[PDB]
Amino acid sequence: QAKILEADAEILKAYAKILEAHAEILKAQ
Amino acid sequence: QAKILEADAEILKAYAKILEAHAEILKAQ
Amino acid sequence: QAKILEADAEILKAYAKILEAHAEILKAQ
Amino acid sequence: QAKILEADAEILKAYAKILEAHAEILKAQ
Amino acid sequence: QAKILEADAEILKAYAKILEAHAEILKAQ
Amino acid sequence: QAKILEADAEILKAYAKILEAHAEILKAQ
Amino acid sequence: QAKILEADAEILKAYAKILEAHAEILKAQ
Amino acid sequence: QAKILEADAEILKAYAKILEAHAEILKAQ
Amino acid sequence: QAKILEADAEILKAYAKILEAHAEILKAQ
Amino acid sequence: QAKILEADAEILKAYAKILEAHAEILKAQ
Amino acid sequence: QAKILEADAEILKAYAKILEAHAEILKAQ
Amino acid sequence: QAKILEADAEILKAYAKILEAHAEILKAQ
Amino acid sequence: QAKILEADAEILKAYAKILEAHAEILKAQ
Amino acid sequence: QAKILEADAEILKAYAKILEAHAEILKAQ
Amino acid sequence: QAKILEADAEILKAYAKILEAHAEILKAQ
Amino acid sequence: QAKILEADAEILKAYAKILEAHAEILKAQ
Amino acid sequence: QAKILEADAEILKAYAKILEAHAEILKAQ
Amino acid sequence: QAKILEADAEILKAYAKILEAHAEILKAQ
Amino acid sequence: QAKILEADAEILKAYAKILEAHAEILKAQ
Amino acid sequence: QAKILEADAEILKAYAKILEAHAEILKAQ
Amino acid sequence: QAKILEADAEILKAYAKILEAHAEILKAQ
Amino acid sequence: QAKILEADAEILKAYAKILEAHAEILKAQ
Amino acid sequence: QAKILEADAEILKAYAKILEAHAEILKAQ
Amino acid sequence: QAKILEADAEILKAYAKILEAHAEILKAQ
Amino acid sequence: QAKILEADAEILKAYAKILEAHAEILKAQ
Amino acid sequence: QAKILEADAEILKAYAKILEAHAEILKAQ
Amino acid sequence: QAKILEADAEILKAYAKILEAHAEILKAQ
Amino acid sequence: QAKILEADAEILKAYAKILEAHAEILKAQ
Amino acid sequence: QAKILEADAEILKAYAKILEAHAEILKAQ
Amino acid sequence: QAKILEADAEILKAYAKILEAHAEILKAQ
Amino acid sequence: QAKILEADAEILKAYAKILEAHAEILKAQ
Amino acid sequence: QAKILEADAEILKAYAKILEAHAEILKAQ
Amino acid sequence: QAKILEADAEILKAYAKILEAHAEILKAQ
Amino acid sequence: QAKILEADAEILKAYAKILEAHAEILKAQ
Amino acid sequence: QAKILEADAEILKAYAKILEAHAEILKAQ
Amino acid sequence: QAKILEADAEILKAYAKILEAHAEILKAQ
Amino acid sequence: QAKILEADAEILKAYAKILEAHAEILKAQ
Amino acid sequence: QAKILEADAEILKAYAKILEAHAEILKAQ
Amino acid sequence: QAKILEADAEILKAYAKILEAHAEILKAQ
Amino acid sequence: QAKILEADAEILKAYAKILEAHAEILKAQ
Amino acid sequence: QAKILEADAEILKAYAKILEAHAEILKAQ
Amino acid sequence: QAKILEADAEILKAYAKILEAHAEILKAQ
Amino acid sequence: QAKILEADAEILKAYAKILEAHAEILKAQ
Amino acid sequence: QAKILEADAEILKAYAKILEAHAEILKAQ
Amino acid sequence: QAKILEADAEILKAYAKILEAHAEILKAQ
Amino acid sequence: QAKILEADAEILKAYAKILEAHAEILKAQ
Amino acid sequence: QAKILEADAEILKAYAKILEAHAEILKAQ
Amino acid sequence: QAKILEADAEILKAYAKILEAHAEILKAQ
Amino acid sequence: QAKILEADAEILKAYAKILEAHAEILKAQ
Amino acid sequence: QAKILEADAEILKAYAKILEAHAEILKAQ
Amino acid sequence: QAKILEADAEILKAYAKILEAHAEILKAQ
Amino acid sequence: QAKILEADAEILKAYAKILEAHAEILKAQ
Amino acid sequence: QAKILEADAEILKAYAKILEAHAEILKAQ
Amino acid sequence: QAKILEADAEILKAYAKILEAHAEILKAQ
Amino acid sequence: QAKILEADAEILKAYAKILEAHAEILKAQ
């Protein structure tokens, strides 16, 4: 079951990388 | 069982990285 | 089922790389 | 049993990182 | 079914590489 | 047995970091 | 079915290599 | 046996950090 | 049908190798 | 034997830090 | 029909190898 | 043997720091 | 032997700091 | 342990509600 | 654990709504 | 140790209630 | 899990709308 | 040692009660 | 999952429109 | 040495009682 | 999937138009 | 040296009694 | 798929035009 | 696919023209 | 409690500084 | 609570500095 | 709340520094 | 909210620095 | 929004540095 | 938006450094 | 657009370094 | 276009390094 | 085009290193 | 063309290394 | 032609290595 | 011709290695 | 002819290895 | 005979690793 | 004979590691 | 012969490490 | 011959380290 | 010849370290 | 020749360190 | 030539350090 | 808080009017 | 906050007018 | 914000006019 | 933003005129 | 932007004229 | 940009004239 | 670009003349 | 380009002359 | 290029003469 | 060298005697 | 050199005697 929660954390970490990239866009403007 | 709790900690750390990314957006604005 | 969620994370990570590339475009201008 | 208590400490440290990120949100505003 | 979503991730990663290449052109000019 | 008491100290240090984060929020308000 | 999408990804990766080569020409000048 | 007493000192130091954090709250209010 | 699109990717990769060869000429001059 | 007495000194020093933290609480009020 | 497009790709790859040999001749001068 | 007497001095200095902390409370009241 | 007498002086200086701490208590009252 | 995951679901639903309120208030702008 | 995935769906739908409102406000510009 | 995890569930539920009240007060604004 | 994939579809459709608005606004320039 | 963990549970439950009262008083605001 | 590939087609059509507008502006130059 | 740990348990229980009284008096406000 | 290949055709046609405009502007030089 | 540790236990028990009486007085307020 | 091959023909014709203009401008040199 | 072969003929004719101009400028040297 | 009365004295001293500044205005005319 | 009265005294001291500055204006003429 | 009143004092102190600057101008003339 | 008022104080402090610079000009003349 | 007002303060501080530089010119003459 | 105003402040700070450098020439003469 | 203004600031900072170097010559004479 | 202005800044920075080197010569004489 | 100006900067930086080397000779004499 | 100017910079950098070597000779003497 | 100038730079770099070696002799004596 | 000059550089680099070896002898003495 | 000069360089490099071996003897003694 | 003495050194080094492991045990307790 | 003396040094260094391990034993207690 | 004296130095250095380890034991007591 | 004297210096430096170790013993007692 | 005198200086520096160690012995007694 | 006189200075500096060490003995006695 | 005179100054400075060390002896007696 | 920023705008507009009057009166001189 | 930026524009325009008056009055000199 | 950049252009043009008048008056000298 | 770059051109042209007048006045000397 | 590079050409020509005047005035010496 | 390269040629010719005059004046010595 | 290489030849000829003057002046010594 | 190689020949001949004069002055020694 | 090889021959002959003079001066010793 | 190994045997025998005394004194405890 | 190794044997025998006397004293305790 541990890999399921690990994949959940990977999903949310990917979401965090999305928001960091969007931040880097908005900083670059 | 310790890997399950470690995965819980990774979930909440991912949530913290989400909130830090959102703060990075709002700081950049 | 964990590989399905891993593939979801790969999709969103690819999306993050898209926005990072768009950031690098707009920063290079 | 030490790894169980270490995982508990990791959980609460992640919670502290959540609250610090919320502080970053509120300070950035 | 995971190979289908993996192929989707490969498609979007290829599109990200397209945008990085276009960034390489625009940076090189 | 010393690692158990070390883990106890890590638990209480994590709790102290929670209260410091809460203080950082309340100072930032 | 997934091999078709893999071939699509190969097409777009080839396009990315085209644009990288064109960038290499333009950088070399 | 010295590591046991050292861990005891770490426990009480953690409690002192808790009380300093609570003081930091009550000063911040 | 996948071999057709694979051959298309081979065509465009050959064109990319042409452009890299032209780059190697222009760099060597 | 010296490390045992050093750990005793660390215990009482931690107790002193506890009382200084309590002093910080009572002073900040 | 895949062998026809494969032969086209081989023609263009041969042209690229011609161009790379011309590059090596020009570089060695 | 000098480290033993040094640790004795550390013990009594720790007791003095306890007593100064209690002094700091009683002054702060 | 000089470090032994130095440690003796450290012992008596620690006792003097105890007496100064008790003095600071009685002054603060 | 299921209460932890249910609380994680409540946290993420609250984050979704905050993002929806942010969405409608940027829609109003 | 399906509540976690449904909350992820709500989060991603909220991000889609934010991006749609951003699309409308860039259409207005 | 289950009391610790249940208290963690109570803590995260309280944080969810705080975030829900924050969502309502941003809905009112 | 189809809600997640439909949310991905909404995300990419919103990105397509943003790219179309960027396309027409570079057409206007 | 189990008394220490039970005291940790009591501490975290009290922190949860404080956070619940803070949630209620922010609900009243 | 056909919505995902349809959104990919919309993305690629948008990239085609951007490249066509870039072609028109380089025609004007 | 178990008396030290039992005294630590009594200290932490007293801190829990103080926190519970603080929770009650913030509930009364 | 015919929309994907049609968008690929549009992309390569746009690249052909860009290369034709580049050929014309090198003819002008 | 066990007298020293027993005296430490008596000290910490006295501090626990002081904190308990402080808890009762704050309960009375 | 014939649109893809026609676009390949357009790309190769554009490359031929670039090479012809390069041949003319080296004829002028 | 006759357009592809005709474009290959145009490419090779352009390479022949480039080699002819290079041979003429080597005759001039 | 002494810090409270000290703060009261600081308030009244600030008030005395206000009246001294008012005397400075009335003298300076 | 003492920091609140300290801040009140800081407000009044700032007001006294305003009146001293206005006095120094009026004296400076 | 103490930081709010501290910031108020900083506002009025900044106004006092403005007034002293105007004083120094008028004295300099 | 405190950072907003702090930024107001920074604005007016910058204004005071402007007037002191004008004073330094007028004194230097 | 605090970073916006901070940037305003940075603008006016840069203006003050311009005026101090002009002062240093006129003093140096 | 804050990066734009920060860049404006960098422009004016660069102007101030130009002016101080010109002052350095004029002082050195 | 921020990188363009940053590059402008870099241009004027380079000009400032030019005048500082010229001042360093004239001071060195 | 940002890299063009960046290269302009590098040109003028190189010129400043020339002048600093000439200063170092004239200082060393 | 940016690499051309970068090469110009490299030329002038090489000239600066020439003059710094001549400074090293003339200082060493 | 850029590699030619890069080679020019390499020539002058080698010349600077010659003069630095001559400086190292004359300094070592 | 670039490799010829690169070889010239290699010749002069070799001469610089000769002079550095001769310097290292004269330093070693 | 470039390989001839490269061989010349190899000759002079061999001479430099000779003098470095001679220096290593003279340093070793 | 380049291999002749390369063999000359190999001769002198072998001579350099002779002198380095002689250095190894003279250092080893 | 050197390998015999080397083996003696390996024997005593193994004994040292035994005692280090025993210290690692006793430290870990 | 050098390897014999080196082996003697290895023996005594192993003895030093024995005494350092015994120091680790005695320090750990 | 230099390796013999070097081995002698290694012997005496090993003896010094023995005495340093013995000092480390005697300090640790 | 310099390596012989260097080895002599290594011998005497090892002797100095012996005396420093014996000093560390005598200081540690 | 310089390395011989450098080795002489190393010999006498080693002798100075011997005398400093002897001094540290006689001071530590 | 400068390294010879530098080594002479190092010899006499080592002699000065000898005399300072002997002074440190005689001061320590 | 400057390094020769610098080495002369280093010789005489070393002589001055000799005389100051002899002063340390003669003062310490 | 918008009244504060509006009053800041009025202040800065008044400073602009004062600077315009100063510009006019220096135009009259 | 746009009034603040417009007031900054008025301020900088007034500074430009002052600099133009300084320019024409140095033109008159 | 275009008024800010336009005022920057006016400031830089005024500085250019000042430098032109300085160039004229140094031409007259 | 072309006004900014045009003002930069005017600034650098004015610096060129100043350097030309300096060149003329050093030609006259 | 060609005015910028033309001004760079004027700057470098002015530096060449200054260097030519320095050359002829060292020729006159 | 040919003016830049011609100015570089003028710079290097001026440096050549400076070095020739330096060669003549070292011929005179 | 041939002017650059010709100026390089002039520079290297000047360095040859400097080395020849150094050669004859060491011949005269 | 042959002027560069001829200048290299002049440089190497000058180095040969310097080495020959060094050989003569070592023959005289 | 034969001048380069002849200069290499002169360099190697000069090294032979230096080694012969070294052989004679070691024959004299 | 047999004296050295016999001294090693005496050293290890003394260590065995010390360990036997430690063994019997832990037997008595 | 046998005197050196014999002195090493005497040193190690003395260390063995010191360890034996230490063993006899630890036996007496």
Residue numbers in the entry:
A (entry chain U), B (entry chain O), C (entry chain a), D (entry chain I), E (entry chain g), F (entry chain C), ...: 1 to 29
N (entry chain FA), O (entry chain LA), P (entry chain 9), Q (entry chain RA), R (entry chain 3), S (entry chain XA), ...: 101 to 129
Question: What sentences appear in the manuscript?
Answer:
Here we report seven high-resolution cryo-EM structures of filamentous peptide nanotubes based on a cross-α supramolecular architecture that provide insight into the designability of helical peptide filaments. A structural interaction is identified based on an appropriately placed pair of arginine residues (RxxxR) within the corresponding peptide sequences. This local interaction motif, designated as an arginine clasp, is robust within the context of these cross-α assemblies and can guide the coalescence of helical protofilaments into structurally defined cross-α nanotubes. In contrast to most structurally characterized filaments based on synthetic α-helical coiled-coils, the chain axes of the helical protomers are oriented in a plane nearly perpendicular to the long axis of the assembly.
In order to better compare the two models, cryo-EM data were collected on a fresh preparation of Form II filaments. Helical reconstruction afforded an atomic model at 4.2-Å resolution with a different helical symmetry (i.e., a rise of 1.93 Å and a rotation of 124.4°) than that proposed for the original model. The higher resolution model of Form II is consistent with a parallel orientation of the inner-outer helix pair, which was suggested but could not be unambiguously determined in the previous analysis. A structural comparison of the two assemblies indicated that helical protomers were arranged in four (Form I) or three (Form II) cross-helical stacks (i.e., protofilaments) that self-associated laterally to form single-walled and double-walled nanotubes, respectively. The main distinguishing feature between the Form I and Form II assemblies was the mode of lateral association between the respective cross α-helical stacks. Each nanotube was derived from coalesence of three protofilaments derived from the dimeric protomer. However, these were arranged in different symmetries; C3 for 29-20-2 and C1 for Form II. The main difference between the structures was manifested in terms of the lateral interactions between the termini of the protofilaments. These interactions occurred along the direction of the left-handed 12-start and 11-start helices for 29-20-2 and Form II, respectively, as illustrated in the the helical net diagrams of the corresponding assemblies. Among all three structures, the helices within the dimeric asymmetric unit could be superimposed with only minimal differences. Structural overlays of laterally interacting protofilaments indicated a conservation of the interfaces between the three filament structures.
